[PDB]
Design a protein around this ligand. Structure first.
Ligand SMILES: Cc1c(C(=O)O)cccc1N1CCNC1=O
Ligand SMILES: Cc1c(C(=O)O)cccc1N1CCNC1=O
Ligand SMILES: Cc1c(C(=O)O)cccc1N1CCNC1=O
Ligand SMILES: Cc1c(C(=O)O)cccc1N1CCNC1=O
Ligand SMILES: Cc1c(C(=O)O)cccc1N1CCNC1=O
Lengths: 279, 276, 276, 282, 279
């Protein structure tokens, strides 16, 4: 029964992540779409057309987003952020909470830009992912220097309505990006391949995609609701001499585990290295 | 345009491909094209003569003939060309650089020492312009007029796909569609070897493999659907195609093509860093 | 021909592709085509209705409507189809099997029990017939008349390449151009991933990669030259393309495509051995 | 013939494998008298020195004697020895000399820099050849230095053409040539040894497998050199559908055969450059 | 100064191998092209058009080749041989020497077919390669049951005019096929790759192809004229610490030698397995 009656939300950027969050927030009922405004340099994006359908207010002008909004999501590419902050810095007021969703972009760099216009900008850095669109996102956030205690509690309330949300120290966020920020792409790749495997063995493609996705969904839910180690749940499904343990062996023979470690590491390192070139 | 005069500095594979595509398209008569080369014995130069293109060993004569000037020389030769003909660039000229990696900044810097406001366009095209199915991107320079970009798009659209991009995308485009045809020629040779291994005559295997690739690419271009969806559409359960897809996956087929785009892009950037 | 009536048993991806190509080509009006399927809710069936193709759940009605009868069902369904409609085959009928691996002998054996001298043609086509760039081979059966092979070649030539082959080549053709589009869709997805990794927007990367493959395939088809010679022509010394070719070679890129043709061909043969 | 009646005196500083291969080739060609060649080495106990002796080549431990004897002076020592050689006999190079460096990686510029401190216009040519000059089937490229006369390049081409293919290139190609045809015979010797092993594994006597593999490679190379055709086209022409040859080509592809030969040319070229960059820093 | 004045040669099959041998024999001067006849089911082959240019007599009918010829080369695909022998078996005379060039096809299978029509067919089995076209072929042959001593000496004289030729026991020929029969294809692949390597390092393609081919030609000639082991010649070119030994290492690291062993083995096994399916 959550609802932020006194809150206006703006998205600078109207891409995949802005659409997912707006759809999540509306589907949760915590915000009405008409209290959400999004701006984009390209008003012909398919995400823009969809936001219009939901009732979200659209404008080409980032300044109008800022003037309309209390909570301002920066949902542009990381290299776009300094240009955004240059453009609207003089429009940031005391009432604004600036929530940066950009991968790698530090609270320090955002506060430094905005402090040139007005001291004490209220900045929160977050890393979320697109499954907020089905209210099963995974979000972490870190509060900036001038964020009030009520600011983070409020953002946790909002982002908890679309998935898991928790506060972290900012120096964990690049690693979170490699795990749950990039995570859904790893899963989509895995589901495409599992479906290909089902088709090879004779399943219709539609059934194979549905079964694979359901298997992944249920296994993740099992882990989330269990106090048990994932290796323990693996043991419970691996019947002696059976089909599952034979398949696990061929995963191990290809170094399956190391590829996923490789992936989290690669996404995290890229995230840091993008920011370091920015700075 | 009709009154438009075009010149090529460099008369190698790319200049021939472009001149052949332009004249096949009808947008340009061969007599309105002139080309120069340090080597007037190249096969590409003899072919251009058969088509009716004017040839010269002197780059200055090509410049004086031309309105649109294509630089189709190797990237390391561009600075030398610019030094040799920079004093001959007029206000009427549009200089279109085709060299991999060579930046608009480096070209404008060289030419601006002879005359300010050089109209410079950078493009990355590929050799299939010779059959009017090229892939071309271009970026306009500091002093390029709006009509200059539209003239370029009109000309290059006649021999394939053409769109304007920001210049910082062009090295990646080089790795993808600039080098792309070579990946496809390698693949077509291998697919033909495979057909021959399984009993097909070579001439038939080459024709079938090439037709298969053309038709698939055309399908994707004419479809709104994802390439994996099209792959799904043609992968019958338990069948031959899905068995073959598996063996490609087992060799990391996808990663090799990603590697290739990356390597070509990185080499393109690296060559320019050595230039500057 | 104009008076020619065509039927499809099976209304999946291949039947739609063929009907769409045939009607786009102009050789066949949609109203002279009829299709049947055990599942009248498939997307392919709804699309065929929009085009104006007649639909039915009863294979017998398709047979009675048709002069040329395409069997576009899965290979394991062919024997069942033949048992169900074998008594409805007339002398006027030409039965064109599209099923991977299914031999003319097995089809003639089934049908000859109902009426002697069935006119049977086996082909291997592919889905790019939907954009009139298919690759098709066919072999004529024991009782196929000379005009039957020329009618088939005329029809299938309207939607792509078509040539007659000896039947023992068809399983290899399946591995090459039958499964070929799927290899190309996989490659185009990966090439797009590569362009995206190097900074390109996805929509642009897909378009450029697909255009690059189309143009290269068209170049080879229009050239008398070897694919390695065309590769040589586009591999500038020390440049980006030759660097990218090396990384493909280092992963055994060529061998993977050979593997794929072989695996699809072998699976095609293996399925038929299980049939018989 | 016309080179013979020029009665050139040739010197080699360095009496190793390349000096012996060139001396053998030149004398077999009839362009030089063995006793009109002089070679020097700090190590007079090398086997190649003993072979040169038997040929009739004059040998001396004194590099100055080789310089004074010579009209054309080949520098055939290893690359790191070249700057010490140029220090030692730089004062003895005369205006009449053509100095031909065969050392991998060593630039004309580095040689002229040393020699220019003595006489002002040293005539320098850089070449990359290979040991098959010994059977007059070498692959040679050369580049002419700042003060090399046009007649010097022509003379060099005439001489080296007597022992194989020879052509002028810009100097910036020579490190790559080194990785390809300078090191190339070693790749072929490795390949011939392995093909012979494969012959032996399948039941052939070693002597026959060596002969047949070598004849196959020789004939294939000659076919290519005499054909206006792409090597892939020649490959297509011999690969019968479904046959033994295309099956063998597949297993070469599956091991990345092509990439290993590219790796080899690259590794030899890069090493050649790396040794020069080390010398030019010092 | 060799010349077979009293010899007519026929080729059944007019493909790559027949053209190479006819061009080799004519270039050697041992046969005039007008004393050579070739037949082919396809008179539009590019090889057929070239044979016509040399002056070789062409006919669609294998029977005419047999009637014209003394020495009859079977230069068709192996699976074509039994059909050829069925077609012309009744036309084989006492004067004919039948030289089969087909990979894998045994003397026993040929003699069995031809003996049904007339006893004591004179059969020689050979394995040659296309470099006979430049008179640098590599040929081995085995004499059949009814071949006279003069028959093999004659075929060795003829085939020696276009390259190396020697008699072997028939059970070596499948292995020879894997080594020198398929050998030139291995070399063409290697030369394409070496040229690619030269181009990568900055050489024009034309120069790289010429240098690579010359290097291979000279090295093979060096080995043929030396009494020394190929490893010894390798040692003579591998200067300590130098460029060549660095390149040899990277060949070894990829298992270069084992790939060539793999190749000879694969071609030999395929050759045997084709014949075993024939029998
Ligand atoms: C670019 C990006 C990555 C990436 O680098 O792949 C990963 C997670 C989120 C984001 N997003 C989305 C919107 N703005 C961002 O930074
Ligand atoms: C050299 C080159 C590459 C490369 O580096 O492989 C790639 C694409 C285009 C070009 N061209 C063609 C003419 N001038 C260029 O720069
Ligand atoms: C099943 C199939 C394969 C395969 O086995 O992957 C390959 C090519 C065509 C076909 N089709 C389509 C319709 N009926 C068939 O047999
Ligand atoms: C050392 C060397 C290599 C190598 O580095 O392997 C390659 C080619 C030639 C030479 N030679 C021979 C005499 N002096 C040289 O530099
Ligand atoms: C088919 C073939 C192979 C092979 O199987 O690749 C190898 C060597 C020779 C032959 N030839 C040529 C003519 N008739 C033959 O058998």
């Amino acid at each position: 029964n959550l609802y932020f009656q006194s809150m206006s939300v703006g998205f600078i950027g109207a891409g995949q992540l802005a659409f997912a969050l707006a759809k999540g927030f509306t589907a949760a009922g915590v915000l009405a779409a008409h209290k959400i405004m999004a701006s984009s340099p390209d008003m012909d994006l398919a995400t823009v057309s969809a936001l219009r359908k939901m009732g979200v207010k659209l404008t080409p002008h980032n300044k109008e987003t800022v003037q309309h909004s209390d909570v301002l999501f920066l949902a542009v590419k990381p290299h776009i952020i300094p240009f955004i902050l240059d453009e609207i810095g003089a429009d940031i007021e005391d009432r604004h909470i600036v929530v940066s969703c950009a991968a790698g972009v530090t609270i320090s760099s955002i506060e430094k830009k905005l402090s040139a216009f007005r001291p004490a900008p209220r900045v929160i850095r977050c890393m979320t992912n697109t499954p907020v669109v089905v209210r099963e996102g995974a979000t972490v956030y870190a509060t900036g220097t001038h964020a009030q205690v009520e600011d983070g509690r409020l953002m946790e309330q909002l982002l908890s309505s679309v998935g898991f949300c928790t506060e972290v120290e900012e120096d964990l966020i690049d690693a979170v990006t490699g795990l749950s920020g990039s995570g859904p792409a790893y899963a989509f790749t895995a589901l495409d391949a599992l479906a290909d495997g089902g088709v090879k063995m004779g399943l219709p493609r539609r059934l194979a995609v549905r079964l694979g996705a359901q298997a992944l969904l249920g296994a993740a839910k099992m882990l989330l609701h269990s106090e048990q180690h994932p290796g323990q749940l693996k043991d419970n499904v691996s019947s002696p001499g059976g089909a599952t343990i034979h398949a696990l062996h061929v995963l191990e023979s290809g170094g399956f585990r190391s590829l996923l470690i490789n992936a989290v590491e690669a996404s995290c390192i890229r995230t840091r290295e993008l920011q370091s070139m920015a700075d």
